[PDB]
A paper describes a structure:
EnpA is a prophage encoded 1721 residues protein composed of three domains; the N-terminal domain (1350 amino acids) shares homology with phage tail tape measure proteins. The two domains located towards the C-terminus of EnpA are homologous to domains belonging to PG hydrolases with lytic transglycosylase activity (cleaving glycan chains) and M23 peptidase activity (cleaving PG peptides). The functional analysis of the EnpA catalytic domain (EnpACD) revealed its hydrolytic activity on the D-Ala–L-Ala bond, which is characteristic for E. faecalis peptidoglycan, and proposed the minimum substrate of EnpCD to consist of three residues of the donor stem and the amino acids of the cross-bridge. Members of the M23 family are metallopeptidases containing a zinc ion in their active site, coordinated by two histidine and one aspartic acid residues in the conserved motifs: HXXXD and HXH.
Despite multiple attempts to crystallize and solve the EnpACD structure, we were unable to obtain crystals of the wild-type protein diffracting below 4 Å; therefore, we generated an inactive variant of EnpACD H109A. The crystals of this variant gave better diffraction data that were then used to solve the structure of EnpACD at a resolution of 3 Å. The crystal structure revealed five protein molecules in the asymmetric unit (ASU). All EnpACD molecules in the ASU are similar with root-mean-square deviation (RMSD) values of 0.35 Å–0.65 Å and β-factors for chains A–E ranging from 87 to 108 Å2. EnpACD is a globular all β-structure molecule that could be divided into two β-sheets. A central β-sheet creates the bottom of the active site groove while its walls are restricted by three out of four protruding loops, as loop 4 rather sticks to the protein core. The organization of the active site is conserved among the members of the enzymatically active peptidoglycan hydrolases from the M23 family, and a strong electron density corresponding to a metal ion was observed in the close vicinity of His29, Asp33 and His111, residues coordinating Zn2+. EnpACD substrate pocket is placed on the plane of the central β-sheet, and its walls are defined by loops that build a deep (10–20 Å) and very narrow (4–5 Å) groove. In the EnpACD structure, the Arg21 side chain is in close contact with Ser16 and Asp27, suggesting the formation of the hydrogen bond and a salt bridge. The EnpA broader specificity is achieved by opening the binding groove at the prime site making it more accessible for a wider range of substrates.
Author numbering: 2 to 131
């Protein structure tokens, strides 16, 4: 996983990427890490902030960071966004605060890997890149 997420404490992984338990029903498009609302989200990989959105839908408050030539890391369900568009960010820079914005049951951060663009196709962060 060349761009797998490596959140430390207090982030705890809850729902994996891909088809959920059983053979029918839902498909998680990223990896959910649980943590209290307000927990600062440190960026996993350096890149350019080229996508910021506030909505009450799906990922809700989220940022996209271009972390590779054709790969964008998305950090979602924020309670507060702290990156501005154009920001060059380093790994471990705090890009936001955990929330439950959008379509999330409780407090967690949704890490999604997209190819083709900030609204592009999602991939498996655990496996993409090796
Ligand atoms: Zn999710």
């Amino acid at each position: 996983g060349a761009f797998a997420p490596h959140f430390g404490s207090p982030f705890v992984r809850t729902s994996d990427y891909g088809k959920r338990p059983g053979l029918y029903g839902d498909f998680h498009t990223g990896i959910d890490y649980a943590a209290p609302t307000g927990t600062p989200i440190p960026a996993q990989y350096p890149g350019l902030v080229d996508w910021v959105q506030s909505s009450s839908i799906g990922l809700g408050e989220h940022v996209g960071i271009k972390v590779a030539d054709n790969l964008w890391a998305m950090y979602g369900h924020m309670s507060r966004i702290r990156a501005k568009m154009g920001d060059k960010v380093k790994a471990g820079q705090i890009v936001g605060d955990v929330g439950s914005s959008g379509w999330s049951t409780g407090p967690a951060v949704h890490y999604e890997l997209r190819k083709g663009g900030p609204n592009g196709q999602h991939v498996n962060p655990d496996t993409y890149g090796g």
